Write a protein that binds this ligand. Sequence first.
Ligand SMILES: Nc1ncnc2c1ncn2[C@@H]1O[C@H](COP(=O)(O)OP(=O)(O)NP(=O)(O)O)[C@@H](O)[C@H]1O
Ligand SMILES: Nc1ncnc2c1ncn2[C@@H]1O[C@H](COP(=O)(O)OP(=O)(O)NP(=O)(O)O)[C@@H](O)[C@H]1O
Ligand SMILES: [Mg+2]
Ligand SMILES: [Mg+2]
Ligand code: NA
Ligand code: NA
Ligand code: NA
Lengths: 297, 290
Amino acid sequence: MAEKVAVLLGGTSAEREVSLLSGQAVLAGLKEAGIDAYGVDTKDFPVTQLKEQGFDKVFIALHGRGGEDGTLQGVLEFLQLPYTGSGVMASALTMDKLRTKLVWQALGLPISPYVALNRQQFETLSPEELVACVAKLGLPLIVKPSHVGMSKVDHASELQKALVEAFQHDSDVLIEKWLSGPEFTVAILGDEVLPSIRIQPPGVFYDYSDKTQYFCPSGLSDESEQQLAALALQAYHALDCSGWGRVDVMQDRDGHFYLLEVNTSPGMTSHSLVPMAARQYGLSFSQLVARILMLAD
Amino acid sequence: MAEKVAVLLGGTSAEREVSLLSGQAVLAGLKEAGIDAYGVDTKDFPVTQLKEQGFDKVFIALHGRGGEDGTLQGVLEFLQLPYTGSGVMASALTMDKLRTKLVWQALGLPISPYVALNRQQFETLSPEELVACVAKLGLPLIVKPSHESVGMSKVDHASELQKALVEAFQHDSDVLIEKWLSGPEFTVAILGDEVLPSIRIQPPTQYFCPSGLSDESEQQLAALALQAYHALDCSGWGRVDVMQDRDGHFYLLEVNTSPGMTSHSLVPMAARQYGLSFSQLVARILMLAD
Ligand SMILES: Nc1ncnc2c1ncn2[C@@H]1O[C@H](COP(=O)(O)OP(=O)(O)NP(=O)(O)O)[C@@H](O)[C@H]1O
Ligand SMILES: Nc1ncnc2c1ncn2[C@@H]1O[C@H](COP(=O)(O)OP(=O)(O)NP(=O)(O)O)[C@@H](O)[C@H]1O
Ligand SMILES: [Mg+2]
Ligand SMILES: [Mg+2]
Ligand code: NA
Ligand code: NA
Ligand code: NA
């Protein structure tokens, strides 16, 4: 018998608005392909009741907290409903910058040099020791929390300052070497790596708008794109991802690629990265979402 | 109001019968400490209904799948009940032996030499080419599926390897081949930020608490166990497992995020040695859920 599919959307996180748009597009795409899909705004319907409502399969179109971080996935494993995107472990681990970095580094995948700090060694030390500690990183630097309130840093007086603003919403902190750019992103769909996209934000960060420019194709030489494609796939399997996702990557002045992050529930607005990548690989939006759904075992 | 507390016990996993005992003990210890606790056999009671039925706090005494793997933790995060033990990420991570290892390795924490192998590599490669991948590890060898002794084999001669890989590629797409260690084995219970006293395990099982180690070795082991526990983002409580080599080096094996709470279990025995009654132990664990 045919599947009843729930498209989860909206939610209660900071990214509710984008998620409303993503879910709306996913919904229209699935109905175009003949899938018996139904929208579910999770602000108002409890995800713990999907099974009672008669659903067979879940398409996850939520973003941020409670959507891509393992918690929803755990609910779905408890109910024994198949769902799109990565499982609990991968979904949660991709939110944790420190441990994502550790997994990659143990495998010898390229990451920007960094130094981790918790609040202990933070308060158990002062600026004359903190600067010697990072000295080997050079300048300038990025200070961010392990799990939004980050800074760029140019010389050694600026450091101490920015460290304390980072502990205002996290307890483990990363101090990374600054990379020149440019920034790229690589969508993965099952095992297929799609065309990369160059991203230029106006300021120093590609943080949380409307000005940001994107380039498809990305302008990389051909040899450069195979390297970035293979690396992306490795980085995605490294964290045990599956179904689909998006790997974020940055070049440095030397031209080498460094891994930043994997996003386990990407935006699916008409203006979003994955659909733009897919259209360039030659897939309609409708085929994209039918495929993601097919990849949910 | 006194907070109403659910001790989750039983479940539907292989570890059910052990879990009924853990939960029965925890139930009795929370009551002795003045806590308004109720046993909840989650085989019979969903867990998605715990908020609706009026519970305020959850003590997890479930073991294995659906208990210590992040799925339960995810449900409780969604219902927003405070609960005992590690969060989603740590509970799930600790069931992935490969990635546990990778994290520890990158922090320079000591683990046994190993090789990891996925099904695609097993398919592509001849038995001899395999023996060649794991040669640098010597013999004997331990073969385990990567996902938490089902499918686990001790391999003494290179010609037993295939059979061991096959038995394990049953249960997982990822398998670990490790260097065997001559022991003995240790376990270090952690309770919040306190490291309790270790226990020597001598299997074929005798448990020794105290462990026999020098003070100076106990300090090393406690510090090492703490770092291994924080490396994986654990909190609340947990049990860390460690082995020695012939030379007395410690190597990390695993962190357990929902340990046994029967009268014959390790954590309770470490607690006893620390000067705690069982009632005190479970009350402390619950205080650490906020
Ligand atoms: N070492 C670095 N050097 C230069 N730019 C960086 C570095 N790390 C991160 N960035 C920039 O900051 C952006 C967002 O940082 P990220 O590493 O995703 O942390 P985050 O807190 O998750 N920010 P957000 O994307 O809002 O989640 C990246 O996409 C880059 O543009
Ligand atoms: N490298 C090793 N050398 C010697 N003994 C080992 C090694 N790895 C595992 N063992 C023994 O096997 C036991 C189980 O190890 P573990 O790494 O937890 O695998 P497992 O499949 O989780 N088995 P269990 O914990 O019983 O589910 C340990 O407690 C050790 O006594
Ligand atoms: Mg980010
Ligand atoms: Mg184990
Ligand atoms: Na994620
Ligand atoms: Na666990
Ligand atoms: Na030595």
